[PDB]
Symmetry: D2
Subunit: 430 residues, 4 copies
Amino acid sequence: VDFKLSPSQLEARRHAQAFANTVLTKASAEYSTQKDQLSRFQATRPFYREAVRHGLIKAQVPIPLGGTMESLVHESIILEELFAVEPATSITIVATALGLMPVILCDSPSLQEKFLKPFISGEGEPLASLMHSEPNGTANWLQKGGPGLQTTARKVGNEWVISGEKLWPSNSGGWDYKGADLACVVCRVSDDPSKPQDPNVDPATQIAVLLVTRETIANNKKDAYQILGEPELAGHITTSGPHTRFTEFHVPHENLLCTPGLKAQGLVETAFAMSAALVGAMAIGTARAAFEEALVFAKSDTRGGSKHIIEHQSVADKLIDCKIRLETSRLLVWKAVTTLEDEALEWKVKLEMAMQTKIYTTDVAVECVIDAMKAVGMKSYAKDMSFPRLLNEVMCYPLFDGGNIGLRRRQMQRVMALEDYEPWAATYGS
Amino acid sequence: VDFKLSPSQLEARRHAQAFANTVLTKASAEYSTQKDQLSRFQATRPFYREAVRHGLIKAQVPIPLGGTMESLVHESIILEELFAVEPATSITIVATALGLMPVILCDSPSLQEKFLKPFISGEGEPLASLMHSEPNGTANWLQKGGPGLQTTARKVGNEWVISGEKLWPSNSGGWDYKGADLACVVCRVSDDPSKPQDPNVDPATQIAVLLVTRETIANNKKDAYQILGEPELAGHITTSGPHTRFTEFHVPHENLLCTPGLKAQGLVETAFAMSAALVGAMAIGTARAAFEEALVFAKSDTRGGSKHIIEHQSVADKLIDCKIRLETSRLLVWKAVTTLEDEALEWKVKLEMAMQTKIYTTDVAVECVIDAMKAVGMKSYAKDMSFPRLLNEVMCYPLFDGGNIGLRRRQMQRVMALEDYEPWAATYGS
Amino acid sequence: VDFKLSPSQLEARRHAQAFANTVLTKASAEYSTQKDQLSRFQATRPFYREAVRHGLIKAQVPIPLGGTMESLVHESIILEELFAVEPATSITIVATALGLMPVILCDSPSLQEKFLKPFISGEGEPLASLMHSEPNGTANWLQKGGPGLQTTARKVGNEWVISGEKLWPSNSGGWDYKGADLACVVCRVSDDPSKPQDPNVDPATQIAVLLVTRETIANNKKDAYQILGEPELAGHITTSGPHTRFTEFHVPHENLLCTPGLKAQGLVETAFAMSAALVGAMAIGTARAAFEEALVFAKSDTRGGSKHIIEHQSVADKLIDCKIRLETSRLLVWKAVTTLEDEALEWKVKLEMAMQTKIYTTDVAVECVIDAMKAVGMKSYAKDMSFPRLLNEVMCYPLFDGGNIGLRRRQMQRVMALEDYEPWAATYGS
Amino acid sequence: VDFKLSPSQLEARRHAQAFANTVLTKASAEYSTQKDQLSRFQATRPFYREAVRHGLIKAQVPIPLGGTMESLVHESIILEELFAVEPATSITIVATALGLMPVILCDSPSLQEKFLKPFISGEGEPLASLMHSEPNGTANWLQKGGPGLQTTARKVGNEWVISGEKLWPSNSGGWDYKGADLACVVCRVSDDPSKPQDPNVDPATQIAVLLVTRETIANNKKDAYQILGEPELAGHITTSGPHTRFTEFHVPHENLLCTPGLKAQGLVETAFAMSAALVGAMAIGTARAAFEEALVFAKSDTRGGSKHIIEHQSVADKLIDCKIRLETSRLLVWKAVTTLEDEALEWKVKLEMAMQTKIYTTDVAVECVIDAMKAVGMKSYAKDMSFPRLLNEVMCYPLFDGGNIGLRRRQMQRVMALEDYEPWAATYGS
Ligand SMILES: Cc1cc2nc3c(=O)[nH]c(=O)nc-3n(C[C@H](O)[C@H](O)[C@H](O)COP(=O)(O)OP(=O)(O)OC[C@H]3O[C@@H](n4cnc5c(N)ncnc54)[C@H](O)[C@@H]3O)c2cc1C
Ligand SMILES: Cc1cc2nc3c(=O)[nH]c(=O)nc-3n(C[C@H](O)[C@H](O)[C@H](O)COP(=O)(O)OP(=O)(O)OC[C@H]3O[C@@H](n4cnc5c(N)ncnc54)[C@H](O)[C@@H]3O)c2cc1C
Ligand SMILES: Cc1cc2nc3c(=O)[nH]c(=O)nc-3n(C[C@H](O)[C@H](O)[C@H](O)COP(=O)(O)OP(=O)(O)OC[C@H]3O[C@@H](n4cnc5c(N)ncnc54)[C@H](O)[C@@H]3O)c2cc1C
Ligand SMILES: Cc1cc2nc3c(=O)[nH]c(=O)nc-3n(C[C@H](O)[C@H](O)[C@H](O)COP(=O)(O)OP(=O)(O)OC[C@H]3O[C@@H](n4cnc5c(N)ncnc54)[C@H](O)[C@@H]3O)c2cc1C
């Protein structure tokens, strides 16, 4: 076992850091004063443009597919550096990565060449979105006997017809509400959308992914694709993840990502398992920003006393707890993404490790930001410090990318209950 | 022993609830459109006006002093109901209460009659502020051999001259920055403010409290009293707690609250111990709003599954944990205020109980809000629910009113380290 | 609302302290030499004798039934003092009180007069046991479609015949394995014990409680009642709670406690709700002993340094956290038992409060003992301090008297999920 | 960056597992029948003899020094597997590794060759001990102005004379109270032991380490070396760590480990920093045994319900938290030991990483055992399961090898407060 970073991993860090410090630090003056989420997202477009120019979207796509992604550990180091400075734009890049993952993972090389083209060009501001989440919730989307996804699709001729609503998926409506450049829309196949999901058939066997582009939306009637709203978020105030309604929305058969059923559900689960692992890097960045701000403050401020506050044991204890949470978190992320890259390990081992990672890093990042605030004291509550923004941003992580309580813990639980469960297969082999 | 509420405690609660729902619910539509903190505080003036007409400012003063305060348990009940709905204006009421407290507690009936007069009238919108906190911190203000308070006072003729800065004290500038109707300014006596505090004298013997009114301010040169800034807060966005600088600010000797030294420190300690106990009620109201909103959601929503999510054990575990935190918090607050009202008990015992109460309720209220958010899941993160506001608001409580890490834990540690410490004296007697 | 203790409550405390210090402190010299659990329990008989002589068993029976119980708050005070010194014998008293409860609370005065008689006499060493728990578990005993209790009973002529096994019920075999003086055996009614519980039935409608005395056991064949074993416990090493098998055990119909079904389940639920509330006083006593030992150590020992260890913030922080856990725990126990006593409150309100109390106090007692050990440090790990015993004893509390995870949380969850659940009914009526 | 185990790491694991399962499982049948700590420890001798025969003591010594230690990752894997089964004898091996470390670390090949010889022979049952800890404590041994170590040494011609007492050091009295085969006795140099440590000299400049063998002890008068007692421990009930008194105890100058002062303090600090990282693997072993026992239980028992208990969300939540604690702990240990072996890294970077590791792994192991017990429920409390032993054993870890509260957190705080502290130097370099 080895924890040393290669020259390309150190360069990936230096590059990410330089981009964050020279480009992302300027985003706040653009977005900070806009009234609504969409406006804030739009104000972020020149920074995404720069990220594309710096190669950061091309770096979300594997080299075999014409991108420049070197590894998932490189990706982890990049995301930690970006999120330690500014989640604006950084969040857009990862949302796009998620949006691309089903195509990156699928088994059609002609689909990959066609739909990944804009994202490896190094030009423009192309957005992708994995459109899974819904107004009524998704924690129970695979539950045999329940209503399932309320976004359904039916084959009519040589096309599919989507009806229903999505809520929350990042970048889904694009910069201007005429659509992401690529959206992977996750649907439940229902030949008749009025009738409930058949409780005698496993929900996983009825999943289909349909690829929707700006062209697709332009080819439909205006009322077939409507953005009904844009949630105002506590933190990550510059992301877009709207309420979208498809009404009789036609999509050509060639845009069907794969065979409906277990293969499609598989692509989705895989994409979301990879995000589960990497989301820990974002939480680390946010929490690391809080720790470092509190640390510098505790090593330079006496708070009207005779020594720097880090010399009070209760202050150092908080800082120690923060530092520990960050160190364990990062190791767990690097373990997770490395596990995901291991061809030897069966999927359930990868999936359990990804779930653990998401659950731990996100929950623990919140504690880290709060302890940092408690250590700095009253000054952390004013907006001339970063903590108000970090507090709001950090609370997103346990909730999003599949919340810990409803999705990730239950995905991990299902794995642990299986008869052939091997708790240590990722470490000690099978 | 008994927890039944008297008819007048029940009436205080009905009155508080009616006030909250007829008046305080309208505040948000007024303060929400104001871009800066002072303006938000100013938009809140008509609601404080209504608070005064409803008798709520008069109820912060004991009956023997012309007020209508029935008891601290009545107060605890009122504060919980107000803060469960809207901390805007509610926070102003309690900040005024704290400003009044050094006067309420002092042994001079002439000062009490004079300076409490506007607060017991039922007219206007009179504000009071206890001005203790400073830019450089206050956790170490009584540390022997340290710099001490940087707001100092010196006697010159038949007046005192205040030099230095305060930061954070609620209401201290009034509605218009010409001053609170009553400010208790806490100073360190120093004949020559350019000289450090003398390291061989106990800081507590150099504390003075000087009463500064609007008239005091108007009797000084314009540049003798100035507001340098108004912090933009993460939550409690409608409160004012400015950065104030006194420069050669003259106060009559008749305005000195009491003899400088241990008597003055003692009045500040007592005031802040009473607030330590009652700040729990504010934390309970906020956390209670989060718990109730999560409870109703959990009972009303299936999240696309086969049953309401309260029926999931992980969801119920969060709700159970919130409920336990709230229940234990309320009990401890009522214990602490009843203990403060007990004439048979020594100060050290009351102080220890008040510290415990502040530490427990405020730390635990934060966990209550966060767990509530986790239970609700993603929808908790959007501002169509109340959680974004509650999370920002709840994080104030561990930090303010004497932070838990630097001030309240240290005060309690000091009492616990005394040779005659009796842990259980508030319960089982001495 | 009032927390002040009456003269009789203070006397109850004094009496309980004097008993624990002059009698219970001598127990260890006797049980300590005994190599198995039963023999340790037997070694404890002379101390239970003394407890009876001091009126402590009589104090577990209400005055209208010939006992001397003053109130549940008196009971809480007695238990805290007892368990602060020595859980040996204390645990027998409390287990007997649980065994008496179904008879104390039943609607048959003839059963009360006959079966409580030995317990109000003030003589001998009479034991009672509520025999509910089983080798296969009881967390799911009321699960519809589940196997239910494996101890069943059937009516044959003018008798009931019991088949199956119990495990864990305190005192159940008596001093000599010829039986407790009174055992309430909870059975599921089944005319054929080889047949699985009907999945269509509500399991609570099948419950019967049969009273079994030493004369009942003697009236049966010797192999109809056998003790198969006695668990060797991590702590509470002097308690007995054996593995008992009933094989065609005949009981007179006049020993049926009440109408089978909902009424019988209700008596058991009520007895265990009462124990849920009071078990916190035992947790508090154990945790309090750990806190006070650490506190005395922290204020007298420098650990080879220049100052008492309580002077170190990290140490003081552990002690503060223990103190707060103990203070909140006692308040919650007093609230719970006062709630149970309230004639005007509905059952589910009482039950919910009792569940909260059990969950909180027992979880938090464990943390209190462990934090106290960390504060004292390495010396806490050797048996010349009490912490090794306290750690083993405290870990009983979250697991016993209905475990928190499987029973108490799920009882509380069920009440919260009821359409008419009112969270603050025990405090703010309505 | 890589977590993959080499073939030799996998072989170390297999070999350690086979030794634990074939040899160590048999230990309990021998030590459980003995009446006190010493006897239990003595009953452990044949198992240590087997460990020596299987090369496990030789594997504590680096290959350059004639041992077989392959790497600290190898050692971590071995310790996790040993402590997962049986800490008896396992504890003796690690205590011997600690005892050897000051010699392994020193810069004197002639000392190394002489004193390490029995330990690399593969013969007998040689024991080492690092005798640091004392009756009065050691958390403040380096405190300037404090009393310091109460075990002192004075130079008398060509010999040193030791006065004072040790308490706790494992193996220090050997199998028979005639001494460990090698003890490294840490002393404070003092010409006159009746005089207090000079408050004007930095305690670390007065540290000496004297090597004491069985020959040294036999060459002194009988009353010069006395075992006064053997603590009865809550867990690890088969280790020896006696109370030793040196009275005018003569040691040859050629047995001095190095020049007294910073160099000697540095060997002690380094040895204890290496143990701090590795003790994590012991904590993991114990917690892993709890987790796996709870997991097997939860996957095979319904607890009288219809489904395996792991299907209940609150049970799964506990197992998930245990699993996460174990995964993060192991990563942190492997990171910490790999950091210690990195010659490019400054000592303070290694030290910080080792303290973090000790703090985290030992605190969290306790939580893991307790969670596992709560998940299993009542049955976990009886000695037919492993948990009573594991609970007592896991509580050792945060207290021993320098407790977290008094020692490790203070050592880490000291590093963090340094002006040139680089928090991430172990991951991203300097
Ligand atoms: C900034 C941001 C970016 C996002 N990016 C995307 C994106 O790119 N694509 C996309 O599709 N979505 C995205 N989301 C949404 C998010 O990934 C999912 O909606 C969310 O994580 C799922 O919500 P939830 O887990 O709370 O599930 P919900 O279904 O909303 O359930 C909510 C709560 O109900 C409870 N619950 C429900 N069922 C159970 C159960 N069976 N067991 C136990 N508890 C249960 C749990 O407490 C759960 O937390 C984004 C959201 C945000 C804020
Ligand atoms: C909405 C609001 C209302 C307020 N109302 C008032 C008011 O009416 N009047 C008023 O005067 N102020 C008021 N305040 C200010 C507040 O009461 C105090 O400034 C704040 O509670 C004290 O800050 P602190 O406890 O963080 O101490 P600081 O001195 O700022 O110390 C900050 C941190 O340093 C550490 N620290 C410092 N010294 C030590 C030590 N010796 N040991 C351990 N740790 C230490 C702790 O981590 C502490 O949290 C208000 C503030 C707000 C936001
Ligand atoms: C000293 C002592 C005295 C005792 N006194 C008595 C007495 O007087 N009378 C008596 O009858 N018993 C007595 N007991 C036994 C004890 O009250 C119960 O057996 C125990 O509290 C119930 O066990 P449990 O709660 O762990 O349930 P179990 O049925 O053993 O369940 C074990 C675990 O399975 C899980 N589980 C099972 N079902 C669910 C579910 N539906 N949801 C979630 N999790 C689940 C939980 O993690 C639970 O902890 C005593 C025991 C001791 C040690
Ligand atoms: C099985 C076992 C094996 C052991 N092996 C060895 C061995 O091989 N060699 C050896 O020498 N010892 C050994 N020990 C002993 C152990 O390493 C040390 O004595 C112990 O870890 C140090 O004790 P402590 O950390 O509790 O410090 P203590 O000095 O005993 O301090 C006790 C407590 O006081 C408080 N405290 C003291 N000073 C401060 C401070 N400055 N700041 C904050 N809090 C403070 C802390 O709460 C601390 O926990 C062993 C013990 C056991 C049980």
